[PDB]
Design a protein around this nucleic acid. Structure first.
Ligand SMILES: [K+]
Ligand SMILES: [K+]
Ligand SMILES: [K+]
Ligand SMILES: [K+]
Ligand SMILES: [K+]
Ligand SMILES: [K+]
Ligand SMILES: [Mg+2]
Ligand SMILES: [Mg+2]
Ligand SMILES: [Mg+2]
Ligand SMILES: [Mg+2]
Ligand SMILES: [Mg+2]
Ligand SMILES: [Mg+2]
Ligand SMILES: [Mg+2]
Ligand SMILES: [Mg+2]
Ligand SMILES: [Mg+2]
Ligand SMILES: [Mg+2]
Ligand SMILES: [Mg+2]
Ligand SMILES: [Mg+2]
Ligand SMILES: [Mg+2]
Ligand SMILES: [Mg+2]
Lengths: 130, 55, 123, 114, 123
RNA sequence: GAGCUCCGGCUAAUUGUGUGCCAGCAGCCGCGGGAAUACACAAGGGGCCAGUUUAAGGUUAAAACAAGGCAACGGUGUUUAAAAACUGGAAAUGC
RNA sequence: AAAGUGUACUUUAUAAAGUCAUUGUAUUGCUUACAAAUAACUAGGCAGUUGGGUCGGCUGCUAUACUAUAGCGCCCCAAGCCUGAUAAUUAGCUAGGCGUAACAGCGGCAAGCCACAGUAGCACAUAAAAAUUGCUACCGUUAACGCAGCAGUAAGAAAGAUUGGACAAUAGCUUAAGGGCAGAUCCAGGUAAGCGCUAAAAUCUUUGUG
RNA sequence: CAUAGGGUUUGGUUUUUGCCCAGCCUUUAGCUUAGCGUUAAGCUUAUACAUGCUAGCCUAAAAGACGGCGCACAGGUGCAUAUUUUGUAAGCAUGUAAAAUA
């Protein structure tokens, strides 16, 4: 076992290195339950640009150092990073204009109707494929 | 070797069938939830008109 | 428990040997594929292939069982039977009989009593 | 059939617990001496009985045993309303996996099929 | 308990003490008598029961009761001790086996001779 | 046939003599203060049997995952609470 | 390779063969993951410590993979790594096995793996190897020896067998002249696990007499 | 191949908790004990050891190992070891690569 894992990035402080957390369960014969446990694995990152909080896939590889024997193969999800410049633009748009009770409610209703209509078309296409 | 090759083809066919089932189910749930949201939106519009009169 | 070995020896020979599985003065043997240099009844084996009962029965015969297909397989790989196993295979017709060298030593006059002090006490 | 119970029975008389387990015909009786005498009177021939709890008062123990026997249900209770034929069948009972392993034996082939 | 409590060492096996701790899980122990005297039992009994203080080969000192009618034990006498408690004597938890190295059997005993170290009369 | 042990109750198996809270017995409840089926002996009987009866260890006679309590005694002074486990919810403003 | 090769060795009016030396398509392999007793009246641990770069890491003699286990070692560079960690107590492990309806609990037998040979550090020995191989210091007896190889002796302990026979069989070492070696092993002696049988005679067993 | 209880706490009853006994398996001690065949076995000390034995066989550059092959096999113990180990699973590049057959 231990050929492949999917986990979360918890440390990117090393050069071309990363630490990934893994979850697994163990069977306890006496109490007839599965016990949840955790482990930490160090993996090699050629890109050297990982972010703490990413979901990545690591694979078994030749030993590279004392505690590094895995290589990062792919990223399944990218962690969110705060950007002040983008946030300031959004705040300006929100403060640019304001609507009344009725206008805001009518706008909300129209937006939902348009989203619902597109979803119905997609569902019909899926049924046609079936 | 011949048996192994057939198994790989069988696995690919089974995976494709499973994905289609899940995709349809997800769309069905999403459509139902959106309909509920639309009904609440129509109710809110009526309250907004009523509240404006009080102001 | 007694998982059979899979890797072949690198510095020793494979042989087909007799393993003593009898009782007091009631011998019984099992044929197995084992490393040449080991204990007689060691648990390290590649396969068990047969059995032999050397004593006569009411019908006046000895009884011997063997796997015909597996004996050929191991003989092809390089397993070397011992002297007694050659005799069993020769009589059973699995392989031709192996000739023996000429003998000159005066045979032993006390072969069934020399090693049994109980008889010598009566003698 | 006049020798055992219809199914498993568990009864809770005040501060006493009694359990009854059916057994195959001819197996025998496995119970305490008091219940052995009671089974002889009623005619029960094959059964397993286990009693636990506050068993100091033997009047309650006997009363609990009496009430348990009266909680059985029969295949012919209101059979006219079912619209079917309730037929007796022959099926050998099984034991747990541990009992097979310790005895070095196998279960019915219908379950070992692979 | 909950599942989490059970997993984190919730249950601990009950521990029970021995009744003859001085024997160190041995059926018997040899010793040498230090003092021989008599003691009185607790209520409601009344008697002068014979006891001796023995130092065991492991260095422990215990009180031992001498069964039977009469004894020849003195100070500096080798005896063998076993388990067994005298209920009416407080603190006495061991007994002396009679008939062994120095202790002798009760004179005149006719019944249960084995428990008092008396041989069968040949006459 | 031959020995070892037991015969108040749990537990299959009793009478006599001696002793008189003395000598002693005892796995538990307990026996012995001049009328002892429980001490010692004799007889009779029960069990096992070339074995038998103590002592000392493993496990069972549900320590409770199947399966115990906080109602005989045990829930801690109260609240807040980024681990873990389980898992959607009805909050904010104004005279 | 249960093989080939030789200006080599041995035997033969009878000869087939073996002995010794040498030879293999890369010329004897490393790494990772999970499980397995108590333990917080053990709360901090680590600085070669965590990661990166150059160099070294030998025993040659197909070609590429841009060097193709490794802080394994030196130098340099960046500050990271672990946190029921670190430190303690106890135990050889697996398993046969014994109790139990099971779950659980405990650890005499046949066999497999690991460690050790009075204590400790080293040299050979890499790949299948140090009880019966060496060097040094130390401990105990007397320059030597260390029975946890078989039998045996002394002390200790409630409790531990003969200073026996044989290589006839099974397995092993050597040897082409058919032999040699052997406390493995097979047999016997001793000790009330267990299992079986005997401890009384009968037409001198009508399975007889003739 | 499938789950058995009894005794005890002295105004009575009910209820809670503790204590003791009956089975199977294994070693010693007392008393006692005819023989033959056979199965499974040697359960405390890595305490100190008189004596005998357990690995040798073959060959020869002048009658001799200095040379070849074995002692890398068997047999003993559980001091140390909580993981260095044990029990398992997984990973490790290429049409094995050259040459006019013009
Ligand atoms: K007495
Ligand atoms: K409680
Ligand atoms: K308080
Ligand atoms: K050492
Ligand atoms: K020992
Ligand atoms: K050679
Ligand atoms: Mg019960
Ligand atoms: Mg008595
Ligand atoms: Mg009676
Ligand atoms: Mg009595
Ligand atoms: Mg009496
Ligand atoms: Mg140890
Ligand atoms: Mg050493
Ligand atoms: Mg060796
Ligand atoms: Mg020594
Ligand atoms: Mg010895
Ligand atoms: Mg031979
Ligand atoms: Mg005895
Ligand atoms: Mg039983
Ligand atoms: Mg040679």
């Amino acid at each position: 076992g231990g050929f492949e894992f999917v986990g979360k990035v918890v440390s990117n402080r090393m050069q071309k290195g990363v630490v990934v957390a893994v979850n697994y369960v163990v069977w306890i014969p006496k109490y007839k339950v599965y016990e949840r446990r955790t482990a930490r694995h160090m993996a090699h990152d050629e890109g050297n640009s990982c972010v703490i909080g990413d979901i990545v896939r690591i694979q078994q590889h030749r030993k590279l150092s004392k505690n590094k024997a895995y290589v990062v193969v792919s990223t399944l999800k990218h962690a969110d990073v705060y950007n002040a410049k983008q946030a300031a633009v959004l705040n300006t748009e929100r403060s640019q204009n304001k609507l009344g009770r009725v206008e805001y409610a009518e706008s909300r209703l129209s937006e939902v109707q348009q989203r619902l209509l597109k979803l119905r078309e997609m569902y019909q296409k899926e049924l046609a494929l079936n | 070797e011949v048996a192994a090759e057939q198994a790989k083809v069988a696995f690919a066919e089974q995976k494709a069938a499973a994905e289609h089932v899940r995709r349809q189910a997800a769309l069905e749930e999403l459509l139902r939830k959106t309909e509920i949201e639309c009904q609440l939106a129509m109710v809110r519009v009526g309250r907004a008109q009523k509240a404006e009169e009080t102001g | 428990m007694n998982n059979l070995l899979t890797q072949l020896p690198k510095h020793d020979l494979l042989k087909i040997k007799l393993v003593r599985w009898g009782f007091n003065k009631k011998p019984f043997y099992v044929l197995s594929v084992m490393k040449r240099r080991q204990a007689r009844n060691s648990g390290n084996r590649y396969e068990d292939i047969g059995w032999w009962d050397p004593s006569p029965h009411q019908d006046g015969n000895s009884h011997f069982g063997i796997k015909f297909d597996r004996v050929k397989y191991w003989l092809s790989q390089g397993a070397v039977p011992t002297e007694k196993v050659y005799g069993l295979f020769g009589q059973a017709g699995i392989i031709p009989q192996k000739p023996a060298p000429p003998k000159y030593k005066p045979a032993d006059g006390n072969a069934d009593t020399k090693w049994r002090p109980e008889l010598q006490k009566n003698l | 059939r006049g020798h055992t119970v219809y199914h498993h029975v568990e009864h809770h008389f005040q501060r006493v617990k009694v359990t009854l387990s059916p057994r195959t015909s001819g197996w025998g009786l496995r119970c305490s001496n008091l219940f052995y005498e009671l089974c002889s009177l009623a005619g029960i021939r094959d059964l397993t009985v286990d009693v636990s709890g506050a068993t100091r008062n033997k009047f309650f123990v006997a009363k609990a045993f009496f009430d348990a026997l009266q909680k059985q249900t029969a295949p012919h209770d209101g059979v006219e309303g079912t619209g079917v034929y309730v037929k007796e069948v022959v099926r050998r009972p099984v034991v747990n996996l541990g009992t097979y392993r310790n005895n070095g034996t196998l279960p019915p082939k219908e379950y070992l099929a692979t | 308990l909950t599942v989490g409590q059970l997993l984190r060492g919730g249950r601990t096996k009950k521990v029970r003490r021995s009744k003859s701790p001085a024997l160190e899980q041995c059926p018997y122990k040899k010793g040498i008598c230090l003092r021989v005297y008599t003691t009185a039992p607790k209520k409601p009994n009344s008697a002068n029961r014979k006891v001796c203080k023995v130092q065991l080969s492991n260095g422990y000192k215990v009180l031992a009761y001498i069964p039977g009618e009469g004894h020849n034990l003195q100070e500096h006498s080798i005896v063998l001790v076993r388990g067994g408690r005298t209920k009416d004597l407080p603190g006495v938890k061991y007994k002396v086996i009679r008939g062994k190295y120095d202790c002798a059997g009760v004179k005149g005993r006719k019944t249960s001779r084995s428990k008092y170290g008396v041989k069968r009369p040949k006459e």
